[PDB]
């Protein structure tokens, strides 16, 4: 029964071309959330409708400790809004831009949580995520991973079924996508490898500012391995960043189970990962529920048929 009126709007957390995300507080409960607000007209013009419905379904249907939980979806005459758990710790992109690299143990911890979430999306939800990156991996108040931004997900991908859409983020695109081949859920383990590489090496495995020359590096060159990198981390990166998805770690029928087995993750206990019993290597140091020191200044420092009805977009979680 939810409208813009049910919340106060406190701090802007994010704003790209389609919309914005604001830290809000729900008047009836005193609870704090992040609200992504989309203008319907802009979504229709920019061709983001099908992406928005995907994100709505993926959020509604997913229940996992490392996926942003959805509380409400609701619309007005001009807006679509998702009200989701607030991730108080900001983007991994934030942290890694300031610290340069994570220790192997810190990277291992985030990697395990990411693998847990991805395995659930693939196995339980028949979903391929497709846009894994540092920017869309957030940390909650305890320092656990929250995946956000489900708009580029593919639905209904069961086992090794394939897909065709050229989408993602250029710096993270797997070779098989660039080859204009049909591609499977192993694209998400390439993403994982790029994320893990950045975490432990402090740069992207393939880099050129220009998307086109970058693509050439991805298809043509072998990754470099800084001499500080341990033998397990080396082998994990080399397996996840195999260019042929059939040869990639996680690329077979076992999917995530093959990565979980890998010696880099030895003595990660996967059931404790899921049950959130592992000790986060970093706890966000917030004063209040509204402290946004882990978000970018550009945004937080800011003061707060063409428009169709979306059938049954509305949703409310419960027990």
């Amino acid at each position: 029964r939810v409208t813009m009126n049910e919340f106060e709007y406190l701090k802007l957390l994010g704003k790209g071309t389609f919309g914005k995300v604001i830290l809000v507080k729900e008047k009836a409960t005193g609870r704090y959330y992040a609200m992504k607000i989309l203008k319907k007209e802009v979504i229709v013009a920019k061709d983001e409708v099908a992406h928005t419905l995907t994100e709505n379904r993926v959020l509604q249907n997913s229940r996992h400790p490392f996926l942003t939980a959805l509380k409400y979806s609701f619309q007005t005459h001009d807006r679509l809004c998702f009200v989701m758990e607030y991730a108080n710790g900001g983007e991994l992109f934030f942290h890694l831009s300031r610290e340069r690299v994570f220790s192997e143990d810190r990277a291992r911890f985030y990697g395990a949580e990411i693998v847990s979430a991805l395995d659930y999306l693939h196995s339980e939800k028949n979903v391929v995520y497709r846009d894994l990156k540092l920017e869309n991996l957030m940390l909650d108040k305890d320092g656990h991973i929250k995946i956000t931004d489900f708009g580029l997900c593919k639905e209904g991908i069961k086992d090794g079924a394939t897909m065709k859409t050229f989408c993602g983020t250029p710096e993270y695109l797997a070779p098989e996508v660039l080859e204009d081949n049909d591609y499977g859920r192993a694209v998400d383990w390439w993403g994982l490898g790029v994320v893990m590489y950045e975490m432990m090496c402090g740069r992207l495995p393939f880099y050129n500012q220009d998307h086109e020359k970058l693509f050439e590096l991805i298809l043509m060159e072998e990754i470099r391995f800084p001499r500080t990198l341990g033998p397990e981390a080396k082998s994990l990166l080399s397996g996840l960043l195999k260019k042929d998805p059939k040869q990639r770690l996680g690329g077979g029928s076992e999917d995530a189970k093959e990565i979980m087995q890998h010696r880099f993750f030895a003595g990660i206990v996967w059931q404790h990962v899921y049950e959130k019993k592992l000790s986060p290597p970093f706890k966000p140091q917030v004063t209040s529920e509204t402290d946004t020191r882990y978000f970018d200044e550009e945004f937080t420092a800011q003061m707060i048929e063409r428009r169709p009805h979306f059938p049954q977009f509305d949703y409310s979680a419960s027990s």
């Binding site: 831009s97 990156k133 580029l152 989408c167 993602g168 983020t169 993270y172 880099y207």
Partner: peptide, 10 residues
Amino acid sequence: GRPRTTSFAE
């Protein structure tokens, strides 16, 4: 300390 990337779909 790389620049922020941009997601796309064609």
